[PDB]
Design a protein around this motif. Structure first.
Motif, PDB file in Angstrom:
ATOM      1  N   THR A 165       0.842  -1.187   0.000  1.00 24.08           N
ATOM      2  CA  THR A 165       0.000   0.000   0.000  1.00 24.08           C
ATOM      3  C   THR A 165       0.881   1.241   0.000  1.00 24.08           C
ATOM      4  O   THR A 165       1.944   1.226   0.619  1.00 24.08           O
ATOM      5  CB  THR A 165      -0.868   0.047   1.297  1.00 24.08           C
TER       6      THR A 165
ATOM      7  N   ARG B 278      -0.248   0.197  -6.872  1.00 20.37           N
ATOM      8  CA  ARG B 278       0.044  -0.850  -7.870  1.00 20.37           C
ATOM      9  C   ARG B 278       1.546  -1.027  -8.003  1.00 20.37           C
ATOM     10  O   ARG B 278       2.280  -0.045  -8.019  1.00 20.37           O
ATOM     11  CB  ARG B 278      -0.565  -0.468  -9.236  1.00 20.37           C
TER      12      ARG B 278
ATOM     13  N   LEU C 257       5.999   1.075  -5.965  1.00 24.98           N
ATOM     14  CA  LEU C 257       4.566   1.284  -6.146  1.00 24.98           C
ATOM     15  C   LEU C 257       4.237   2.701  -6.638  1.00 24.98           C
ATOM     16  O   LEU C 257       4.974   3.650  -6.362  1.00 24.98           O
ATOM     17  CB  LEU C 257       3.830   1.175  -4.753  1.00 24.98           C
ATOM     18  N   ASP C 258       3.122   2.822  -7.349  1.00 24.71           N
ATOM     19  CA  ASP C 258       2.600   4.143  -7.693  1.00 24.71           C
ATOM     20  C   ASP C 258       1.610   4.583  -6.593  1.00 24.71           C
ATOM     21  O   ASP C 258       1.358   3.837  -5.644  1.00 24.71           O
ATOM     22  CB  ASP C 258       1.943   4.180  -9.069  1.00 24.71           C
TER      23      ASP C 258
ATOM     24  N   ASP D  99      -2.104 -12.071  -0.714  1.00 23.35           N
ATOM     25  CA  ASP D  99      -1.412 -11.026  -1.439  1.00 23.35           C
ATOM     26  C   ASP D  99      -0.533 -10.243  -0.437  1.00 23.35           C
ATOM     27  O   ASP D  99      -0.897 -10.136   0.766  1.00 23.35           O
ATOM     28  CB  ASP D  99      -2.431 -10.023  -2.039  1.00 23.35           C
TER      29      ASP D  99
ATOM     30  N   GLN E 275       0.680 -11.885  -5.772  1.00 21.48           N
ATOM     31  CA  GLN E 275      -0.452 -11.220  -6.365  1.00 21.48           C
ATOM     32  C   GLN E 275      -1.190 -12.197  -7.254  1.00 21.48           C
ATOM     33  O   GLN E 275      -0.558 -12.868  -8.090  1.00 21.48           O
ATOM     34  CB  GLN E 275      -0.057  -9.951  -7.139  1.00 21.48           C
TER      35      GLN E 275
ATOM     36  N   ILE F  59       4.716  -1.212  -9.879  1.00 24.71           N
ATOM     37  CA  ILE F  59       5.245  -0.804 -11.192  1.00 24.71           C
ATOM     38  C   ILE F  59       6.581  -1.453 -11.565  1.00 24.71           C
ATOM     39  O   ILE F  59       7.087  -1.224 -12.675  1.00 24.71           O
ATOM     40  CB  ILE F  59       5.333   0.758 -11.330  1.00 24.71           C
TER      41      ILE F  59
ATOM     42  N   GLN G 298      10.139  -4.187 -14.661  1.00 25.00           N
ATOM     43  CA  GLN G 298       8.767  -4.718 -14.730  1.00 25.00           C
ATOM     44  C   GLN G 298       8.677  -5.811 -15.843  1.00 25.00           C
ATOM     45  O   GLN G 298       9.360  -5.705 -16.869  1.00 25.00           O
ATOM     46  CB  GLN G 298       7.788  -3.572 -15.072  1.00 25.00           C
TER      47      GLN G 298
ATOM     48  N   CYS H 105      -1.573   4.625  -6.504  1.00 25.53           N
ATOM     49  CA  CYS H 105      -2.706   3.698  -6.333  1.00 25.53           C
ATOM     50  C   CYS H 105      -2.311   2.384  -5.655  1.00 25.53           C
ATOM     51  O   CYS H 105      -3.155   1.492  -5.528  1.00 25.53           O
ATOM     52  CB  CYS H 105      -3.416   3.420  -7.648  1.00 25.53           C
TER      53      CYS H 105
ATOM     54  N   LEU I  58       2.061  -8.709 -12.883  1.00 25.92           N
ATOM     55  CA  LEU I  58       2.221  -7.264 -12.614  1.00 25.92           C
ATOM     56  C   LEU I  58       2.387  -6.491 -13.919  1.00 25.92           C
ATOM     57  O   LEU I  58       3.325  -6.738 -14.672  1.00 25.92           O
ATOM     58  CB  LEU I  58       3.420  -7.014 -11.695  1.00 25.92           C
ATOM     59  N   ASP I  59       1.495  -5.498 -14.150  1.00 24.08           N
ATOM     60  CA  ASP I  59       1.585  -4.772 -15.421  1.00 24.08           C
ATOM     61  C   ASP I  59       1.549  -3.272 -15.305  1.00 24.08           C
ATOM     62  O   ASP I  59       1.584  -2.595 -16.356  1.00 24.08           O
ATOM     63  CB  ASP I  59       0.511  -5.227 -16.427  1.00 24.08           C
ATOM     64  N   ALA I  60       1.475  -2.730 -14.091  1.00 20.93           N
ATOM     65  CA  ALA I  60       1.485  -1.269 -13.958  1.00 20.93           C
ATOM     66  C   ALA I  60       2.839  -0.705 -14.377  1.00 20.93           C
ATOM     67  O   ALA I  60       3.887  -1.344 -14.227  1.00 20.93           O
ATOM     68  CB  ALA I  60       1.124  -0.839 -12.535  1.00 20.93           C
TER      69      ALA I  60
END
Ligand SMILES: c1ccc2c(N3CCNCC3)ccnc2c1
Lengths: 39, 156
Positions: A11, B130, B125-126, B5, B27, B132, B152, B128, B70-72
């Motif tokens: 998160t 997700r 992470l970004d 997760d 995930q 990356i 990635q 949101c 994972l695709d972000a």
């Protein structure tokens, strides 16, 4: 023999510690997955 | 084994005591880490076994139990967070503005944060939440400091 252990949720943390610079580097990637600097 | 997760340490008891060799992401029932952490070996999760499913030494990535999920992608403008999981230490978020690795095949985001080798596979992470990419494959620049690519995989 390798094993995994949960360490946390994934998160975004509001007001996390902010650091690190943003270097723009020319790099090369070889067949073994090693990155190196290009000069 | 535990399939929830989240972020996990990758440990071994082959060396002195219990040693953390890296980190990964669970995930959608798939475990994601960097190839150099496991060298493609099977993993244990409690009494269960995770077998490799896809891997690539050049990308330095590996997935277990299923294909890479994972695709972000980094947007090229915003700050991101490294969810660093260092050996023997609590998971901690570090916010940073990525730099760039410029290559003959295109540009990749890069994070200039220096952690122990055992932190490889920690997720970036970004805003949101997700993932990356994963931290831990990079270069040592002039001043001796470490800069990691934001690595990635492709979601087939
Ligand atoms: C993740 C992966 C590698 C490193 C690392 N390298 C160890 C040996 N190769 C050059 C630098 C030094 C410091 N932090 C790291 C984090």
């Amino acid at each position: 023999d390798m094993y995994i252990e949960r360490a946390g949720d994934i998160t975004w943390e509001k007001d996390a510690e902010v650091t690190g610079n943003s270097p723009r580097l020319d790099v090369a990637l070889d067949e073994s997955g090693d990155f190196s600097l290009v000069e | 084994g535990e399939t929830t997760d989240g972020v996990y340490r990758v440990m071994t008891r082959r060396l002195l005591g219990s040693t953390q060799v890296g980190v990964g992401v669970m995930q959608e029932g798939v475990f994601h880490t960097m190839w150099h952490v496991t060298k493609g070996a099977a993993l244990r999760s409690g009494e269960g076994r995770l077998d490799p499913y896809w891997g690539d030494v050049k990308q330095d990535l590996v997935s277990y139990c299923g294909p890479w999920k994972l695709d972000a992608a980094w947007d090229g403008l915003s700050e991101v967070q490294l969810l660093a999981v260092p050996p023997g230490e609590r998971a901690k978020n570090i916010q940073t503005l990525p730099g760039i690795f410029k290559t003959k095949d295109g540009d990749i985001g890069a994070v200039a944060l220096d952690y122990p080798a055992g932190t490889s596979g920690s997720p970036i992470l970004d805003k949101c939440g997700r993932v990356i990419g994963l931290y831990g494959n990079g270069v040592v620049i002039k001043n001796g400091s470490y800069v990691s690519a934001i690595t990635q995989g492709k979601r087939e």
